[PDB]
């Protein structure tokens, strides 16, 4: 759908300098202002480069567009943790696909952060839940990093396949990463096992909570 | 100090219409267009159409088949965008925009979202996750609220008013297989602030109208 071609993903160091390119033709980037925005995961997109190259208000100068042709590149200097969003380019466009078209966006990442193994918290079923006939076991994954884990559940010893869900890690306000994964049980489910564990997987090795009714 | 400010997430039927408005502040309201685009969850921006506040010119995306239709109120500087005979493919946070020339489009609203869905709103089910001698470690204990079955999207959560924001992570919403969604959101505190410190978590589900403050407390 995206008229305007840019890499799905793009990544750095810190302190690299990223490029990320927009191609399109003579009716759009060749003949028209390009426009850049950068995006963080739930906000909006927000202006970066205006008219190929401008910076509007409180845009630091290590963030250039530029164009050439019927081509355009976003450059970032002095990459940091902090630039880890989306980034999209955009164009007035002049033929039917016009008046106005994007660029399919591309994430950048930001490599060479400091490895942390995740802390692992097991919440039981809260009372309330137990005395409105429900139980949920929550497991909270925090402060690691790469942002990848597995999660497995046992009852017991026994593994647990139904009753799973699990979500994407995503950034803490400390730039690491969190995840989440929960169990959905019966009171008497619950009740009825000595213990229940909730087993991480981060970087091949694994961190595994316990907790007993 | 360019202000643009959206109405709230809604739930609508197929077949259905949506109206969303889009409140501008800080410039001359007719000094510049304003654009809709939308974005599909996780997925990137399609640009809907734009209207000109000073002379009424309107221009649609043709993908959309005619369904959208674009008005502005300049008494109260506030845009609206209609689309109408809703399907779940249409289901998407909605920008509004404003547009020109050199600038293209520059400043953004917060985005509304619009889940097109045969089923009814339903709030949330709040729990409270205590902190204990099993959730604490070496100093410092995770406490937290489980904001359970609710639907649609969005659901947001603060701490004690607002009051409390260092050490607390909102976990991203999963989708049940009852299609509803479940969320939780963590905080971690100090042990030795367990006695003498309260927590309440504000839970708000705008489309059901609902709000929760579950208190948690020591087991």
């Known amino acids: 759908q995206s008229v305007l071609t840019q890499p799905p993903s793009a990544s750095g160091t810190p302190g690299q300098r990223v490029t990320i390119s927009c191609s399109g033709s003579?009716?759009?980037?060749?003949?028209?202002?390009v426009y850049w925005y950068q995006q963080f995961p739930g906000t909006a997109p927000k202006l970066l480069i205006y008219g190929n190259n401008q910076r509007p208000s409180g845009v630091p100068d290590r963030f250039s567009g530029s164009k050439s042709g019927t081509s355009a590149s976003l450059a970032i200097s002095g990459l940091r943790s902090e630039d880890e969003a989306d980034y999209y380019c955009?164009?007035?466009?002049?033929?039917?696909?016009?008046?106005?078209?994007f660029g399919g966006g591309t994430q950048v990442t930001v490599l060479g952060q400091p490895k942390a193994a995740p802390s692992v918290t097991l919440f039981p079923p809260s009372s309330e839940e137990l005395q409105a006939n429900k139980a949920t076991l929550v497991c909270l994954i925090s402060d690691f990093y790469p942002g990848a884990v597995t999660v497995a559940w046992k009852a017991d010893s026994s593994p647990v396949k139904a009753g799973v869900e699990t979500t994407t890690p995503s950034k803490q306000s400390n730039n690491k990463y969190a995840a989440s994964s929960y169990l959905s049980l019966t009171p008497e489910q619950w009740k009825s096992h000595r213990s229940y564990s909730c087993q991480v997987t981060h970087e091949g090795s694994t961190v595994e909570k316990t907790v007993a009714p | 100090q360019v202000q643009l400010v959206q109405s709230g997430a809604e739930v609508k039927k197929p077949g259905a219409s949506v109206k969303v408005s889009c409140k501008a502040s800080?410039?001359?309201?007719?000094?510049?267009?304003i654009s809709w685009v939308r974005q599909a969850p996780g997925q990137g921006l399609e640009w809907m159409g734009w209207?000109?506040?000073?002379?009424?010119?309107?221009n649609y995306a043709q993908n959309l088949q005619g369904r959208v239709t674009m008005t502005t109120d300049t008494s109260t500087s506030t845009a609206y965008m209609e689309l109408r005979s809703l399907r779940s493919d249409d289901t998407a946070v909605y920008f509004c925009?404003?547009?020109?020339?050199?600038?293209?489009?520059?400043?953004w609203g917060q985005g509304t979202l619009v889940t097109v869905s045969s089923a009814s709103t339903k709030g949330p089910s709040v729990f409270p996750l205590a902190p204990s001698s099993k959730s604490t470690s070496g100093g410092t204990a995770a406490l937290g609220c489980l904001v359970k079955d609710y639907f649609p999207e969005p659901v947001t959560v603060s701490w004690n008013s607002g009051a409390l924001t260092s050490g607390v992570h909102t976990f991203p919403a999963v989708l049940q297989s009852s299609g509803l969604y479940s969320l939780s959101s963590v905080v971690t505190v100090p042990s030795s602030s367990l006695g003498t410190q309260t927590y309440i978590c504000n839970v708000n589900h705008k489309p059901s109208n609902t709000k929760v403050d579950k208190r948690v407390e020591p087991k």
């Open positions: 003579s009716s759009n980037i060749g003949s028209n202002y």
């Open positions: 955009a164009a007035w466009d002049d033929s039917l696909s016009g008046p106005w078209v």
């Open positions: 925009a404003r547009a020109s020339q050199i600038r293209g489009v520059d400043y």
């Open positions: 800080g410039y001359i309201f007719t000094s510049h267009g």
């Open positions: 209207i000109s506040v000073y002379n009424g010119y309107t």
